[PDB]
Every structure is written in structure tokens, then in C-alpha cells.
Amino acid sequence: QTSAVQQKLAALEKSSGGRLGVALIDTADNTQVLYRGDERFPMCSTSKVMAAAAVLKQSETQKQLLNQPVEIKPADLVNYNPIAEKHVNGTMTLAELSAAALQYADNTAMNKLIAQLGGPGGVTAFARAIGDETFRLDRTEPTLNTAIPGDPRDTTTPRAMAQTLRQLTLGHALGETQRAQLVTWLKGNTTGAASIRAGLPTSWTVGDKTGSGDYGTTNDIAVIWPQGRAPLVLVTYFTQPQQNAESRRDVLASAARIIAEGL
């Protein structure tokens, strides 16, 4: 089958010169609308949601865990550390690290979450534990963002990520307090204004996590509450042929608009 939303997503893709993947879940009627929805895409920073959620899950049994101070040493600093670089030779809590990773895309913070989970395999392990058999996290920051065409490392599919984000933010993969914290974190993201949120009616409330990497990889995953009606989950992944391709957040805004117009 091929819906007219798919016809406009395909044209958007052709216009873009890149590879677009989209997956929407309408919770109201549990319907799904997908474009290259089973192809793999580099997740880039959108993988931080899985790592933050995995640490929240540990916090269900370890009740003070989010309050635990974690040292920031000079050697922990990587390529983009907007919050952590302010605390080197001091400490940050796992809550602070989670907020820095999710809301400011801090790669040092992500690496602290990965370390708390025992390595990238501990993030993948949480994905398998909540039903996601597609997600794979293989590297730490910054190398998980190489987004090399054909490389299965650090990839998921639009379908799998939208199903997972639903479970974490709207379902009960997490404890209620942990889910609420994740939602609070996602809603306060500072990096998404030009991506999914830019394609959506202003009155809709959004939580999202962006991602960016080599090959112009430009991603966003969002939980959407559109006032009146039931929430939506939308993932938009985009990647391009040239390793040094520029960011294309507009494509994600545009995919989101097409998806919103087809409701």
C-alpha cells in the first residue's frame, strides 16, 4: 500500500537529496504511518534517550541514584560538553548529567550515563529488556556519531524507536516517577526548535531529543500532546551521501508538518 502522506514524504525526500525515515504512532487509534520505517539510520544523540531511561530504570530500585555525585575530570571531556565543561574538577549528579545529555546534547554527560550502565552493552541491554530488538548501541561519544553509510553500529529503525519512545514516555516501561522525569526532561530540551517542533502547530506540547552527526545526519524523536486529542509519537531520521554534508533540520520540520497535515 502507499498513502498520500507517503507520497509527500517521498517527494520531500527526493527534494532533499538524502535518505529520510519517519515513523508516527497515533495513540488514539494506535495507528502507524511510516516511511523507510524498517531501514536502519544512525541514531546519533537520539540514543541518549535510551541511556537516560536505562539509568532511570536503575533508580527505581536505587532510590537516591539520581542524586549521586559523579566526578567530571579533564580526561572525561570529549567533543561537545556544554554543561560538563563547567564542572570539570568538580561533580555533577546523575540527574544533572541526564538533564545535560537530554536537554543540551552534552556528549560527556552521555558518556557518564553509559559508564553507569556498564558500557554501551548496558544501554542495548535496557532496549532488549523493554522489548526493543532493533536498537543497538556499540560505541561511546563521540564515535557513535560516525553515521557511516551501511554501518550497523549505533543504529535503529524509525519503527523501533517510535515504539520504544512510546513505551518510555506514555507506557510503563519505566516507573511512574521515572516516566514523569523523562517527560519533564524531554519537554525542556533546548536543541529542538528547528526540527520536529518547527513543523507542528504551536499549541501542541512537545518533548523531543535531536541528534546530529556525520553524513549530515539530522534526527529528532518526539512525544507530542496535541491539546484535546491523545498524544502522538514521531521519529524523523535523515542522513545524506556526503560525509561532510550540512545539517538539515528543515527536512525534519517538513516531515513533521506533512505528518500533522495528514492526521
45 is catalytic: yes
Strand order of the β-sheet with 232-239 is 31-35, 19-26, 232-239, 217-225, 205-213
Residue 263 grid cell: 492526521
- Tell the smallest beta-carbon distance from residue 167 to K ion (Å): 24
| SS3 label, residue 69 | strand
**Pick 130 or 196: Cβ nearer K ion:** 196
Question: Of 41-49, 128-136, 148-156, 235-243, which part binds K ion (CB under 5 A)?
Answer: 41-49
Query: Which residues, 77 to 96, sit near K ion by CB under 5 A?
Result: 80
Candidates 20, 22, 105, 109; binder of K ion (CB under 5 A) is: 105
Q: Give which of 19, 12, 40 is closest to 216, Cα–Cα.
A: 19
- The closest alpha carbon to 158, from 261, 234, 251, 68, belongs to 234
Query: Is 100 among the residues that bind K ion (CB under 5 A)?
Result: no
Does 147 contact K ion by CB under 5 A? no
Report CA Rg, the chain.
17
Provide, rounded to whole angstroms, the least separation between the CB of residue 230 and K ion: 31
Cβ neighbours of 11 (radius 10 Å): 11
First to last CA, the chain: 18
Distance CA 51, CA 110 (A): 7
Catalytic residue among 45, 59, 212, 254: 45
Task: Please report how many Cα atoms fall inside a 13 Å half-sphere around the Cα of residue 115, on the Cβ side.
Answer: 13
User: Binding of K ion at residue 221 (CB under 5 A)?
Assistant: no
Interface with K ion includes 182 (CB under 5 A)? no
Please, what is the minimum distance in Å from the beta carbon of residue 236 to K ion? 17
SS3 (DSSP) at 237? strand
| Closer residue to K ion in complex, CB, 45/103 | 45
Q: Angle CA(251)–CA(254)–CA(258) in degrees, nearest 5?
A: 135
User: Does 186 interact with K ion (rule: CB under 5 A)?
Assistant: no
User: Taking CB positions, which residue lies at the least distance from K ion?
Assistant: 105
The reply on whether position 45 binds K ion by CB under 5 A is: yes
| Binding flag, residue 114, K ion (CB under 5 A) | no
169, 182 contact by CB (below 8 A):
yes
Shortest distance (Å) from residue 55 CB to K ion: 17
Question: Binding residues for K ion, how many (CB under 5 A)?
Answer: 3
Residue 193 CB, nearest approach to K ion (Å)? 15
Residues near K ion (CB under 5 A) are: 45, 80, 105
Active-site residue set: 45
